[PDB]
Amino acid sequence: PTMYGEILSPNYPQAYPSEVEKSWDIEVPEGYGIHLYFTHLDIELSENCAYDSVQIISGDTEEGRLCGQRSSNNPHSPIVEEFQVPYNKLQVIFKSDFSNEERFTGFAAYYVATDINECTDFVDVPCSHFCNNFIGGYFCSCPPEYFLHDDMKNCGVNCSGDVFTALIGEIASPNYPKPYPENSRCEYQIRLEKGFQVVVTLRREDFDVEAADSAGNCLDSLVFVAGDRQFGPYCGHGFPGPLNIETKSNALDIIFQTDLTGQKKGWKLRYHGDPM
Ligand SMILES: [Ca+2]
Ligand SMILES: [Ca+2]
Ligand SMILES: [Ca+2]
Ligand code: NA
């Protein structure tokens, strides 16, 4: 694991021996790519570089096979051949055949590690909101009052915590009646004494959540969990369920989950205990 280095042909800068087969495994750290460039190339020329050749293998494909005698036509650089790969590993192989008629001096080449911009180079952004690239990695950041989930990728608001124990109460989505936040998971816990069940009361007009997709699946969802029984998911304009919902349990979890896009008014419900 290195940041740079050189690769010289056997007996460089003098003639390379015949019947040789040397290999180099290049490895830079993760989050880095590799820039490989040749500053010297003096190898026996042949069709498809059959006899003598230097070979470059990156990842799973062959990047190049080099032979012949070529110099730098640009006076401002000694580079005659270069390669740029987005992988942290690279392979160089040099083969010389049985005999060398002329004076061939082989090759000199150098490699340096290059940073990957995970924020732009990747096909799909690794952050829900903002991506911050640095050298050897990247990190995700969130807008004000948003917080980074345990995956260090998704941002959401803090809309959990309070446990409800009162025999009657009122619960509403964040920022009600202004639009609710995105990419968040809100959790409300209602805990009544054993003799009572939790009854939820939701007015039809007090409920506006993003509509479900064409398949009928809710992207943002409101769900009531009572032990084994589940109520919902609920979606759409207007509460789909009944006005009075008997959960038949003294313990209820209300989980409102949102995705990254599409926010509407939200909801407001009331709960009350009922003797059993
Ligand atoms: Ca040879
Ligand atoms: Ca990076
Ligand atoms: Ca949404
Ligand atoms: Na050489």
Curated annotation (Swiss-Prot):
As stated in the Swiss-Prot or TrEMBL entry, residues carrying the post-translational modification (3R)-3-hydroxyasparagine are N133
| List of residues binding Ca(2+) 2 | D115, I116, E118, N133, F134, G137
Q: What is this protein called?
A: Complement C1s subcomponent heavy chain
Q: Which residues form the CUB domain?
A: 1-114, 159-274
| High-level lineage | Eukaryota, Metazoa, Chordata, Craniata, Vertebrata
Give residue ranges for domain EGF-like. 115-156
Source organism:
Homo sapiens
Q: Which residues are glycosylated?
A: N158
Membrane-spanning segments:
none
- Residues bound to Ca(2+) 3: E210, D220, D259, G262, Q263
* Disulfide bond sites: C49-C67, C119-C131, C127-C140, C142-C155, C159-C186, C218-C235
The record lists the effect of D259A as:
Does not affect association with the C1Q subcomplex
List of residues binding Ca(2+) 1? E44, D52, D97
